[PDB]
Design a protein around this ligand. Structure first.
Ligand SMILES: O=S(=O)(O)CCN1CCN(CCS(=O)(=O)O)CC1
Ligand SMILES: O=S(=O)(O)CCN1CCN(CCS(=O)(=O)O)CC1
Ligand SMILES: O=S(=O)(O)CCN1CCN(CCS(=O)(=O)O)CC1
Lengths: 492, 500, 500, 492
């Protein structure tokens, strides 16, 4: 998911829309924009679809105001495609809206406590609605009006003591302003930027990725620190405060592999440079372990891998060729009467340049392997195009465990690497050779750009969950949610 | 524009839709699909928009049948977003539908003769509707039913003697089959493929590019020859015939520079390889001519130039770096009362990775320069990202003339290269240096993939039009068409706005 | 179906739209409007739905021009909701569009001759598309331009000798003007009106009913005579001509019973007065034949019967009371998994005021009885509301035959009156008593408004078809059309449902 | 506006939809349906438009559950066409949704108190959102779970002590059930019905009008009494309780004139029979005051007046004729480029049967006269059709004051009768004669059907507001709201 918040001095509707279009890769299922108008009321438009389809001129006209937040959703367990999108909203105390990228590992318990102690009903199964309700509940402990920055930060600090998981959040409180805060492990991405309008006016914005600041002409200030909260008043005054105990930087390593845009700088690391480094490490590993193999050409599987593969080919002294072309436009498959509904294909998303595989031993490079379904079909396509031996290299280590911090991953059972070694995975996908990046190599590739990061969030790779509250019982619970989400989406 | 025609033995609606999605880069303004159903009637769905938006379940349900054609439109003078899309249709004789990629340079005169001699009314400003009417009138000359293959080919031959310009067409005639044909100069692209089902039951397909054949699992047979026609009967039989007097192969060189997909093979030339060769030629030219310059990195301006720049970087022994990222998603800019601080036009398209430009003399590579406006903005973006020297290289030679063969290019006075030396263009765009591909090099780069092609359609580069009927009266007439189109688009907005 | 044609001196889009809204009762399945713009090209918008839903701002914006025609469709065999709506169009000769209300009893044969002799393909099952093609082919016989009025009338005359059935048509020919014409028997309705703007600048209009002229402020001139054609040039000149050999006035009697609006005057007969007279006749028949019965109140079954029942109540000296209220708004009944306790079909249409039936012998009045199914349900509703005796009177005589002249009626075996005595129908519907209007009385009731009309089109009542070409082979062919239409509508639902 | 609530034993989505289609005359601007699903969560669909356009198959599929409420909106001051439609919803305490037909005369003060004492933000300017927040605030005073019927009734009783105005309301509380309640003056209409499914199962429903019970096959039980509340549990148990002090029946007299359907029975009075009685009274008044006039025919102005006019013609011994035909389908007028946007017409809504006016002195009958604009044009049409003298009779007395209890009326200035006598009104509309029903006659016409009603709510006619809190200051306040609503709708 992707978030954006703009505390401006002029209408923000078009700017939030624009920022969301460059964060569109973070989620294409739904989009939502909410602003605070001249009457101190929220105006909201959220619906399923790409940003360009969700917001029509008439919705834009309704989104009045100089402060607003936006969200693009990537479906996850509990927040299916059929469910209510973000931002969520509550009417007490004061009027609060919140957008979130992440996941709370103790959502179910929080929901119980919200109901039993506060009589606050949660209408969806989205942990973001729960997060908003905890925050609201903490903001409701004040008698004086309006709230001071100290009270807002105290409410966030109290919220941080109650919830667990990963979260980059942005919210607005009517009559007060905008708040942005990050989990105490710095797992989900969140940067802060500013735009000087004149001598006395400065606008502020926060976004999941720095590309949103770039596209709008905002100057990058810094990443929001792990545990930190930022509060910008209605009036344009900026406050910041550390709202967690023992904060530490454990950025999600997966953002760097393929999730984030290459032109973003997350926790001082260029995603692009980290990806080139991944190719360097993988090339070095292949040159060492596959020294005797006959490889005629290195072909990336579009699109994140093109540069990684370029670096591999360079390290290996082999030619790099565009053997696969990603179909920029993909359409749907229709369930028609009488007609047999045939095959689910990768041919719909990819085309093989026939001449580039013919009578060659090819080394294909992909960013990662999850279910292994696409790689299987891709290898088959390489063979149909006339390839002799087909080898596959993965820029990421084996993906064996589920992500419960905001990245949608299928359950452990559906991860081909779960409970399987490299050779068995290779035989299943039908490759002549398979090699994965070593985790310590991926770490060094990213860390080379910012040696200050000591440890990253690596759970999908090593099964070590930093919040220490993930056991099989929880993972099974998450699966039941997926099952319910499936029934709902099936229904639509 | 892109076209596709499939004569199958099973339902074609989903396959035509899928073919158009991979041909979508040829035109995103509109799409249309028409099929012949079991009752020998046309079923049609066309509208503005991307293929994925134009066809919904209820439209696919009505598109029944085993034979059909499809089209995606790129708007050109006489065919604006405002006007009716393809494919077009006529009810006499027989019921004929056609789709076309190209342009008829004598459309005006054809429209007049059709009115005067045949009383055939043309409802739009589309030369494709005219092409269809000339074809339909030639088919109306027979007095026995059904028409024989030879009759249909004779009609196409008669049509080619009458019309002039460039065209790749696919059409269907109720009760007979599907026909496809290409202009006498092989300017516009068109390939044929097949898919065997069993003993003597094969499906055939034609499309603007071979990627459409690939995506559907059809075996590529070959390019439809210049001036040739293909006729596939409803019963699945194949016939072909040269229907032009002096066919020559003069493929549009623009398809290779950036219009077609790299994974396509057009007239036996891999588009990808040709582009890599364009990089080899341009890099050698740069090594020879810019020998004294210190360039720290080669940065492509997405998306067509990535492989060209990579090859240029290889020839120069310089690092290649992704300095610009193209925003995959672009939205609408709504006209709002007093749009305070508008987002820069260039930023809507691209984003610069600041680190890749900081304190570096950069060599940017773009596929071509037309108006020169976006080039100037990209150069600016680079200096803004911290570049010291900013050089620009164009994979295509100077674009100085309008294209009247189906590729949308502005008028000559609008082309920055028009009437200007490279150094003048350089000053205007603000580059520290500017260099273009030499035309003979571009030709060699593409010809290297198929030496049999001796001449390419190069008019945008040299002003030489193979149809020899392009004059100022014609260009001026095209400008008029463009003006009426602009008016039609302006009106459509006027109350889309007043409706609020 | 209803049609409208306006040849004005100022934009007609809004006026045609407004005219269709007051003609909306003639068909709510689809609507279409086509205009001739300043460049002599057709601009068209047609789709399923009510006029208010079919035409949005963006469609009206494209419907430019000072002359145009409109149509609203009531679905009939060969023209289902699934099929293409009117108006239809052809591009040769000249560019001709037509809209029609009626039905051609020899459509099949016409389609065959058009194919064989002219190679004219008919894409839909609509006899209106056929009518247009016959007209277009007759117009293709001249070799001088423009066509003279006499040429156009000669073409309409040729068409009338070829086609058979009932029809009110309005059409436009690019570069010439608008024509309107009526069948030789004056079966279907059509009136002409004018609106003076200044010295020798008058706008003309034709429509199915005079309410369309009223609503637009046009002065009513007269009914288009049986077999007559009207031609209004683009320059605003009026021409007319009898284009039929032996025209007779045999107005559809159904228009008067309930199809047309009461405020309309058709062939000089006020629909309202005719209906009041229908009440006078039926009330006198009831007073004579049901003299021994105790009826406490007369209750109309909304909406056409209110004034008829009022008059019947007047003749019987009995109170008239609103016992049923028609639900002005009816929604969709969604097919949901296990629809527990479905709302009664009859309740979707009407609601009974319990107080008006309680312990009363009620006389209900409906305009006609077709299948008899809703009649049985209404009777039930009344007993349920507490009525003791429930009697039913039909303003129309027994409906025993299908209509093949443009009014949608089921087949003969589907009409409850078919092959049954009044007492048998009575038992089936469950009424304590049933009485129908006598046909001669219905005729007198309408004729009283204009004694010049000596014969009406009565086929649904007497089985006598004026075109003398209705046989079982024809009826069976119509049933086939209806079946194919049903299949097309079923398919359209199949994945509207599977899309969820 | 119209409301409906169904506490069933099987899915209610289609039934609520159906009930709203027969209450559609109560408001065509927007419609909303909210149900409580099997998961104890609300599912909602509300939007601008007729009921048949607002709810598509996909929304119906989402509206799962055996309990639900619906609303159709008629735009009023503060709840413009551009504003959020009903039902409104709050997430604490427990989850409550409410739909309302009426208006609170002290909404502005309640909103202030909600903000200052409870920190509850009101996002629209709709008094229904405010009503829901007061109720929620009162329901939030309980510690034990779940709430007993006594607690729910206590919260409604407390709500009744705080708010003032007119209101027929229906609401649902998650985990509890459905509640329906009526203002202490019995101003806005609300009936209760039931449907026996079997020996142990009985469904209940409440609606603005009895026709909604009829169309669904529910048996009419009774009107909900002034001040009374009804609570039906999830489990199907019905409770009722008087929740106001000194309740009294003052039904809105205006519902009977033209607002309600003729087939409804409101406070034991048949709307149809009351309308015939109005014609009887008006006929008697005309036969007495216009004894010497030459009148050739009585012509009703469709559609509510057809029966009233029929009775008048009967009393006068004159023929009744259909001189005007209402166009059942009306379309919009388009703002096109270049074309002059001509006249706003009644000809779009009405057609004159020419033959029925020619050389006749006609007596036209309308249900009421508000702005006087339509009557002016109608009289003109009668003249164009050839009428000699044109007389107009109004089934309702002069409308001189604004309605602040739920019926949309323009401000005092726009009411032709405001500050004007009959003859001046007559001269303005251009009639040859004008006669209005006497208020005491209208009262007797309605009261004849239920002599138990002592006084009705007659403010639009006499300026006496039963809640005693309406002064010019308030009416001016209401106008400023209309002005803001206008700017919003203009904007769209
Ligand atoms: O942004 S807009 O105001 O235009 C749409 C508001 N949005 C519509 C969908 N519902 C959930 C439906 S349900 O889950 O209750 O069925 C959340 C609110
Ligand atoms: O002119 S034609 O009838 O051929 C074309 C008819 N039109 C397509 C519908
Ligand atoms: O904030 S604004 O006033 O601009 C928009 C108000 N918004 C419109 C959409 N509905 C839900 C639609 S649905 O969930 O019923 O489909 C919630 C209220």
């Amino acid at each position: 998911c992707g978030i954006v918040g703009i505390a401006g001095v002029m209408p923000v509707n078009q700017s939030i829309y624009d920022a969301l279009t460059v964060l569109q890769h973070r989620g294409q299922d739904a989009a939502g924009i909410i602003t605070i108008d001249a009457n101190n009321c929220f105006r909201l438009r959220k619906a399923n679809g790409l940003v360009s389809d969700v917001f029509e001129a008439r919705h834009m006209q309704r989104l009045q105001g100089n402060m607003g937040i936006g969200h693009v959703r990537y479906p996850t367990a509990g927040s299916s495609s059929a469910s209510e999108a973000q931002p969520f909203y509550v009417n007490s105390p004061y009027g609060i809206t919140l957008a979130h990228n992440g996941n709370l590992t103790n959502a179910h318990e929080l929901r119980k406590k919200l109901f039993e102690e506060k009589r606050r009903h949660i209408n969806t199964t989205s942990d973001s609605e729960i997060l908003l309700n905890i925050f609201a509940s903490e903001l409701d402990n004040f008698r004086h009006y309006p709230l001071e920055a100290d009270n807002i930060f105290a409410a966030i600090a109290a919220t941080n003591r109650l919830i667990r998981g990963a979260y980059a959040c942005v919210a607005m409180i009517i009559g007060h302003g905008m708040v942005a805060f990050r989990d105490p492990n710095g797992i989900r991405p969140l940067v802060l930027g500013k735009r000087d309008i004149d001598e006395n006016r400065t606008e502020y914005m926060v976004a999941s990725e720095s590309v949103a600041l770039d596209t709008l002409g905002f100057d990058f200030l810094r990443d929001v620190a792990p545990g930190e909260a930022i509060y910008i008043t209605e009036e344009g005054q900026l406050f910041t405060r550390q709202c967690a105990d023992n904060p530490v930087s454990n950025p999600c390593l997966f953002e760097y592999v393929y999730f984030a845009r290459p032109d973003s700088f997350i926790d001082k690391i260029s995603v692009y440079s980290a990806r080139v480094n991944m190719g360097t490490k993988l090339g070095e590993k292949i040159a060492r372990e596959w020294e005797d193999l006959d490889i005629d050409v290195v072909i990336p599987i579009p699109e994140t891998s093109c540069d990684i593969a370029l670096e591999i080919a360079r390290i290996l002294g082999k030619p790099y060729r565009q053997g696969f072309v990603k179909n920029r436009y993909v359409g749907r498959t229709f369930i028609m009467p009488g007609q047999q509904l045939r095959r689910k294909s990768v041919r719909r998303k990819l085309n093989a340049n026939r001449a580039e595989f013919r009578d060659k031993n090819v080394l294909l490079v992909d960013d990662s392997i999850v279910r292994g379904t696409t790689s299987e079909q891709i290898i088959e396509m390489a063979r149909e195009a006339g390839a002799k031996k087909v080898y596959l290299a993965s820029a990421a280590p084996e993906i064996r465990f589920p992500n419960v911090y905001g990245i949608d991953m299928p359950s452990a059972t559906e991860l081909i690497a779960h409970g399987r070694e490299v050779d068995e995975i290779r035989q299943i996908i039908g490759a002549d050779g398979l090699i994965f990046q070593d985790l310590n190599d991926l770490i060094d590739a990213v860390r080379a750009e910012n040696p200050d990061i000591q440890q990253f969030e690596c759970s999908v790779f090593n099964g070590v969950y930093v919040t220490k509250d993930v056991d099989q019982g929880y993972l099974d619970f998450l699966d039941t949610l997926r099952n319910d989400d499936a029934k709902a989406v099936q229904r639509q």
